[model samples]
Target: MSEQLTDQVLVERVQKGDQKAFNLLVVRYQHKVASLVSRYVPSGDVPDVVQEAFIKAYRALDSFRGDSAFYTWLYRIAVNTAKNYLVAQGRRLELV
Candidate 1:
């Protein structure tokens, strides 16, 4: 039934004390997250970025209200992660 819930509902499961719920979401979304992140991080640092994004999302899960698409929310975070990382490394803000 892990795959049955929408990402939004899945987060609720995690919020209610099911840590494995977050793991399930991570498993389902990691590949898509990594690939989308590759666009923002061309140095092929996708694995690290994706991991950070999932970590950030899981930490922030408590405050999360449902979005229409949780993947949209996740993508926004992953993009922010990639941008912050690149800019911190002296990459141009506008380059991405």
Candidate 2:
């Protein structure tokens, strides 16, 4: 089932200390995370969100479950983090 690699499998590999698998996960989720982050963070901050989310995702890998698509899980985390970052920077928020 090599061709059928699932996100849960990737997450297990990452948790087992496979850096490359984690990188694969990052690559798979990068665009979605960047887009999610953009709603709160500026375009210039997209890279920051990408970097931070991947690192956070890798570190918090244990928290993921197979119930949802991995990208959706990552998207929520990235958006929440970006929104928190913007608010912490003394920026005002408007409903988007």
Candidate 3:
């Protein structure tokens, strides 16, 4: 039986500089990531932040040591990016 592709397998490929593998991960996560981002950022900024999160994740993939799930790492990046972007645009978040 053919083995199913797991995120760990895809991550290994990405670490070896496999662009296609990275693309697959993006496809797998983009919708989920976008939804998470939307909760923290303005609708207009969601797309840009999600893109930035992916780019950051790609660049930092080498540092990912499988200590946590890939999505957890990506989630942190997305939330941080959203907050950082808002700060860059001088959008003060009202504390609830």
Per-candidate Cα lDDT values, in order, are 0.84, 0.80, 0.88
lDDT of 1 by residue, 1-96 (tens): 355567767878899989888899999998898888899887468898889999999888787777557887888899999888877788565558
* lDDT value, residue 3 of candidate 1: 58
Error of 3 at 14 (Å): 0.5
Tell me which of candidates 1 and 2 scores higher on lDDT: 1
Query: Can you give the lDDT of residue 31 in candidate 3?
Result: 95
Q: Evaluated with lDDT, which candidate comes out highest?
A: 3
TM-score for each prediction?
A: 0.82, 0.81, 0.87
Q: Point out where model 3 deviates above 4 Å.
A: 91-96
What is candidate 1's TM-score against the reference? 0.82
Evaluate model 3: give its lDDT.
Answer: 0.88
Model 3: per-residue lDDT, tens digit, 22-83? 99999999999999889888789888899999998998998998989988888898889878
Question: Which sections of candidate 2 miss by over 4 Å?
Answer: 1-3, 91-96
Q: List the residue pairs that clash in candidate 1.
A: none
